[PDB]
């Protein structure tokens, strides 16, 4: 999803997991 965001990755590590496609 919005994994391109530096905050979003930290804010929601479970949603992104390890891919920008989240």
Residue 20's contacts (CB-CB under 8 Å, 6 or more residues apart) are 3, 4
CB contact at 8 A, 12 and 19 = no
Which CA distances in Å does 21 have to 1, 4, 14? 5, 9, 13
Half-sphere exposure of residue 3, counting CA atoms within 13 Å on the CB side? 11
């Amino acid at each position: 999803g919005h994994c391109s965001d530096p905050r979003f990755n930290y804010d929601h590590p479970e949603i992104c997991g390890g891919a920008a496609g989240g």
